[PDB]
Amino acid sequence: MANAPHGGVLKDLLARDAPRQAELAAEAESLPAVTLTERQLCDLELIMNGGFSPLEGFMNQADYDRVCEDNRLADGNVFSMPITLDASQEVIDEKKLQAASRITLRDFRDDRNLAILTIDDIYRPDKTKEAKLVFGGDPEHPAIVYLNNTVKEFYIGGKIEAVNKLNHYDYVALRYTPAELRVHFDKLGWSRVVAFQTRNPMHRAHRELTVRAARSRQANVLIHPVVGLTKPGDIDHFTRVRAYQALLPRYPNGMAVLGLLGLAMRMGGPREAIWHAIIRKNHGATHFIVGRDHAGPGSNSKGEDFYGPYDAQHAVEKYKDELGIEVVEFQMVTYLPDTDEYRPVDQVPAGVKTLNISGTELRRRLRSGAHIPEWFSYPEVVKILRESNPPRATQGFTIFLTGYMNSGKDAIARALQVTLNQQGGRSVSLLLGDTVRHELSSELGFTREDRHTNIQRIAFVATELTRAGAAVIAAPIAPYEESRKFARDAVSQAGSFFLVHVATPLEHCEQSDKRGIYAAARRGEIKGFTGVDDPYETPEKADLVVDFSKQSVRSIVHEIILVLESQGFLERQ
């Protein structure tokens, strides 16, 4: 086999309870139901699949206490991370929860019944104690700011009975239970396996690092990246995974397996590192790389590191032998251009080439689109990591016109459309004031509130189109700063926004009115008409100001085109 489960027996509860599936499923229907948070879900998944072996439920007091203070569960097995389910008095009463109560753990994403937990105790934990003992104490620590702003007042210990495994629709082939991974290592004659934990990109150095370990420890590699619960439309998450997959064939043929790991990290440094060692051991890895600042939060508001570069490694080594897993401490190497190789911080003769790119500099570049050294990260991988920060020539954008009724914005807008359909870089969506009123706001009025709603409605549609990479041209009146500000923020989430104030003077608008709407509004036939009986909050930081009285349309369209051209949006075909 690979490495034995932590505690000697894999707590594969889904396998254990499979035979009763349908009955637990039936009863899971009636029981009082607690709907889990994202953290309790990620935990439940590893509890159920034996990832937290020997653990087999959410921690009760005898486990939790000896874990918070001794890094051990009651039975004596090493375990450095509190795994608990929390509730408030309201719900504990509200649902009659108490020792012996059987409850249903529900998935907040799709409402599935995942498990049935038979209660042990319902204690009120000392969070001040937990934060200091488990995460260091700093009020700024992520897991602490969480333990005090989300975790409820009480913990509910209790063994778990698995009914259904969580449903994930992204990358099922890359999701491996500890059993699947163990079977896999076994089919291929695998014995020693070095697991690599990460929550980041993965470049050349990472590739050279894992390979060297594998080769020196005469072993195979498990690339085990961490993911939390997937956000249906979180493209960043898909980009990340594709990055990893892209990197897979740069590894010696047959040496590695890529596997996603559903873990809700605390960023509890040393303590998480030990936890991690356990989880990989359960997953069948025999070796675990531990890095500098492993699972590290970084530094507080006033530059204090929450942990030192080496505490992780010092922790996992202290327990290493007991746990039965080998640690592989990495001494990351650099690049030697003249050489075309990589070597330890020492295997480099004085004066070779200190070629090493910065992470802050890499992000910086990925953002700017500034070429990245192929010696630093493979092409196909970088090609994918960039997609989450696309080139302006690809981004959709919204041109949001605003100004009095009949200020010429409609004509300007139509001409901008023909102009942009000629440059042909994207599809163009036109949302004229009236079209919007007819299609999406036919039953709204003109009160401050109603107009605001109408604009939020244009922003929403514009924001979806901007996200699809379209060029959206909107020409509502948008009399209020509050509205326009809203539209700008809504759309910015998906691409760029430009406010063009068609500042044509009112008098000009009225005089040229050939529909008598200003006339009717003047004589009360229309209530609170903008400019007449309702205000027009003149824009203050418009991206472009124009006057249909002073400039022709092609000239105006062209000023708009110039702004877009100057920001890289139009890099033509």
Contact call for residue 500 and a second copy (CB under 8 A): no
> Choosing from 124, 148, 150, 199, which is the catalytic residue?
199
436 assigned to a ligand binding site: yes
Please choose, out of 44-52, 67-75, 150-158, 466-474, the segment that lies near a second copy by the rule CB under 8 A.
466-474
Contact residues toward ligand PPS (CB under 6 A) are 405, 433-434, 436-437, 446, 451, 454-455, 476-479, 517, 526, 528-530, 534
71 Cβ contact partners less than 8 Å away, ≥ 6 residues apart: 78, 79, 80, 271, 274, 319
Q: Which is nearer to ligand PPS, 425 or 528 (CB)?
A: 528
- 246: its two tokens: 């892209």
Contact call for residue 554 and a second copy (CB under 8 A): yes
Task: State the nearest-atom distance from the C-beta of 107 to ligand PPS, in Å.
Answer: 18
Using an 8 Å Cβ cutoff, are 538 and 532 in contact? no
Distance between CA atoms of 466 and 447, rounded to whole angstroms? 28
Supply the Cα-derived Rg of the chain in whole angstroms.
30
437 assigned to a ligand binding site: yes
Distance between CA atoms of 35 and 407, rounded to whole angstroms? 54
467 assigned to a ligand binding site: no
> Choosing from 37, 77, 118, 198, which is the catalytic residue?
198
> Choosing from 35, 200, 356, 538, which is the catalytic residue?
200
Looking at this protein, which amino acid is placed at residue 473?
A: I
User: Which entry of ligand PPS, a second copy, none binds 479, CB below 5 to 8 A by partner kind?
Assistant: ligand PPS
Task: State the nearest-atom distance from the C-beta of 454 to ligand PPS, in Å.
Answer: 4
352 assigned to a ligand binding site: no
Distance between CA atoms of 156 and 344, rounded to whole angstroms? 49
Residue 51 DSSP code: T
Task: Spell out a b/e string for 459-479, using b for 16 or more CB atoms within 10 Å of the CB, else e.
Answer: bebbbbbbbebbbbbbbbbbb
Distance between CA atoms of 249 and 244, rounded to whole angstroms? 10
Please give the residues from 172 up to 211 whose contact with a second copy meets the rule CB under 8 A: 172
User: Counting beta carbons within 10 angstroms of the beta carbon of residue 125, is it exposed (0 to 12), middle (13 to 18) or buried (19 or more)?
Assistant: buried
Residue 342 sits at φ, ψ, to 5 deg, of -125, 145
The site that binds a second copy (CB under 8 A) totals a number of residues, namely 76
User: Which entry of a second copy, ligand PPS, none binds 34, CB below 5 to 8 A by partner kind?
Assistant: none
343 assigned to a ligand binding site: no
Task: State the nearest-atom distance from the C-beta of 252 to ligand PPS, in Å.
Answer: 34
Please give the residues from 467 up to 496 whose contact with a second copy meets the rule CB under 8 A: 467-470
User: Which entry of a second copy, ligand PPS, none binds 171, CB below 5 to 8 A by partner kind?
Assistant: a second copy
515 assigned to a ligand binding site: yes
User: Counting beta carbons within 10 angstroms of the beta carbon of residue 324, is it exposed (0 to 12), middle (13 to 18) or buried (19 or more)?
Assistant: middle
Looking at this protein, which amino acid is placed at residue 82?
A: P
Kindly tell me which residue out of 370, 519, 527, 550 binds a second copy, with binding defined by CB under 8 A. 370
User: Which entry of ligand PPS, a second copy, none binds 418, CB below 5 to 8 A by partner kind?
Assistant: a second copy
519 assigned to a ligand binding site: no
Q: Which is nearer to ligand PPS, 143 or 412 (CB)?
A: 412
Please give the residues from 24 up to 63 whose contact with a second copy meets the rule CB under 8 A: none
Distance between CA atoms of 273 and 307, rounded to whole angstroms? 12
User: Counting beta carbons within 10 angstroms of the beta carbon of residue 341, is it exposed (0 to 12), middle (13 to 18) or buried (19 or more)?
Assistant: middle
Please choose, out of 462-470, 478-486, 525-533, 535-543, the segment that lies near a second copy by the rule CB under 8 A.
462-470
E strand segments, 457-559: 471-475, 496-502, 544-546
- As a whole number of angstroms, the longest Cα–Cα distance in the chain is 91
Q: Which is nearer to a second copy, 110 or 540 (CB)?
A: 110
328 assigned to a ligand binding site: no
477 assigned to a ligand binding site: yes
Contact call for residue 414 and a second copy (CB under 8 A): yes
Task: State the nearest-atom distance from the C-beta of 563 to a second copy, in Å.
Answer: 7
Contact call for residue 364 and a second copy (CB under 8 A): no
Kindly tell me which residue out of 418, 449, 485, 541 binds a second copy, with binding defined by CB under 8 A. 418
Using an 8 Å Cβ cutoff, are 187 and 20 in contact? no
Contact call for residue 562 and a second copy (CB under 8 A): yes
Contact call for residue 254 and a second copy (CB under 8 A): yes
198 assigned to active site: yes
235 assigned to a ligand binding site: no
Using an 8 Å Cβ cutoff, are 534 and 446 in contact? yes
Using an 8 Å Cβ cutoff, are 58 and 158 in contact? yes
Task: State the nearest-atom distance from the C-beta of 508 to ligand PPS, in Å.
Answer: 15
Contact call for residue 15 and a second copy (CB under 8 A): no
For 223-292, the DSSP string reads EEEEE-S--TT-HHHHHHHHHHHHHGGGSPTTTEEE-BEE------HHHHHHHHHHHHHHTT-SEEEE-T
Contact call for residue 509 and a second copy (CB under 8 A): no
Task: State the nearest-atom distance from the C-beta of 572 to a second copy, in Å.
Answer: 4
Using an 8 Å Cβ cutoff, are 426 and 395 in contact? no
Q: Which is nearer to a second copy, 143 or 219 (CB)?
A: 219
533 assigned to a ligand binding site: no
| Residue of 461, 320, 485, 476 lying closest to 396 (CA atoms) | 461
199 assigned to active site: yes
H/E segment holding residue 197: strand 193-198
Please give the residues from 87 up to 146 whose contact with a second copy meets the rule CB under 8 A: 109-111
Binding residues for ATP: 197-200, 291-294, 333
Which residues belong to the active site? 198-200
Binding residues for 3'-phosphoadenylyl sulfate: 434-437, 451, 477-478, 515
Binding residues for sulfate: 197, 199, 295
